[PDB]
Amino acid sequence: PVWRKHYITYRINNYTPDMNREDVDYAIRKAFQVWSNVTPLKFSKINTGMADILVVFARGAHGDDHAFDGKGGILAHAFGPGSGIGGDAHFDEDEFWTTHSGGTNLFLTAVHQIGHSLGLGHSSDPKAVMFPTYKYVDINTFRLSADDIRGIQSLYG
Numbered sequence: 001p002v003w004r005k006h007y008i009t010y011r012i013n014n015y016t017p018d019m020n021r022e023d024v025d026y027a028i029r030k031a032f033q034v035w036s037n038v039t040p041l042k043f044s045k046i047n048t049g050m051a052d053i054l055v056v057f058a059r060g061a062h063g064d065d066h067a068f069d070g071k072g073g074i075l076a077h078a079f080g081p082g083s084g085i086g087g088d089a090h091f092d093e094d095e096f097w098t099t100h101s102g103g104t105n106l107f108l109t110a111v112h113q114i115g116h117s118l119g120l121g122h123s124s125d126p127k128a129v130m131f132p133t134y135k136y137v138d139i140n141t142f143r144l145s146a147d148d149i150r151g152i153q154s155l156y157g
């Protein structure tokens with residue numbers, strides 16, 4: 001299933017102490033842009049009320065029956081499109097979130113995760129952002145794969 005709307009709201013539930021807030025805000029917003037640039041979807045940040053996509057930073061057990069696992073291992077996960085917890089993107093706060101390198105990069109992780117929030121599954125092209133394994137790539141040249149674009153457009157046009 002997909003979202004039945006073109007306007008989709010997200011909300012940052014809380015912030016990681018690893019990065020400054022402006023940078024977290026920029027990486028979430030830019031990561032939505034990636035999907036927004038190749039779809040009819042529009043993504044708007046709300047600061048109050050109930051959003052479609054709740055962005056959470058949390059460690060270990062955090063009340064959705066998919067406890068994180070400490071530093072490394074599971075980096076994030078997000079639920080597919082739906083009511084309540086559907087759409088919500090979670091990031092493991094035991095990781096060290098970074099603007100660029102030398103941690104787990106938030107933008108790239110969030111692009112991938114937003115991808116699952118939107119309904120995508122995994123790709124077999126290593127160049128695809130929806131490829132199963134995290135790996136830092138040059139953000140200056142970051143670009144969606146044809147696999148990613150065919151997929152997202154298969155869902156939303």
Ligand SMILES: CC(=O)N[C@@H]1[C@@H](OC(C)=O)[C@H](OC(C)=O)[C@@H](COC(C)=O)O[C@H]1n1cc(CN([C@@H](C(=O)O)C(C)C)S(=O)(=O)c2ccc(-c3ccccc3)cc2)nn1
Nearest residue numbers: 072073074075076077078108109112129131132133134135
């Ligand atoms: C399959 C496997 O071997 N499992 C590894 C496990 O592997 C080995 C060899 O043991 C390993 O656990 C330990 C401790 O050994 C750990 C290794 O990775 C590290 C050190 O980061 O990860 C397990 N793992 C993770 C995930 C999937 N992820 C979730 C997701 O699909 O998004 C999902 C869980 C909801 S995700 O890892 O967190 C993930 C998050 C973000 C990204 C990404 C982000 C930006 C750009 C591209 C990709 C990629 C993956 N599947 N298996």
Ligand SMILES: [Ca+2]
Nearest residue numbers: 052084085086
């Ligand atoms: Ca939700």
Ligand SMILES: [Ca+2]
Nearest residue numbers: 070072074092
């Ligand atoms: Ca982890």
Ligand SMILES: [Ca+2]
Nearest residue numbers: 018093094095
């Ligand atoms: Ca952290």
Ligand SMILES: [Zn+2]
Nearest residue numbers: 062064066090
């Ligand atoms: Zn969770």
Ligand SMILES: [Zn+2]
Nearest residue numbers: 112116122132
């Ligand atoms: Zn994934």
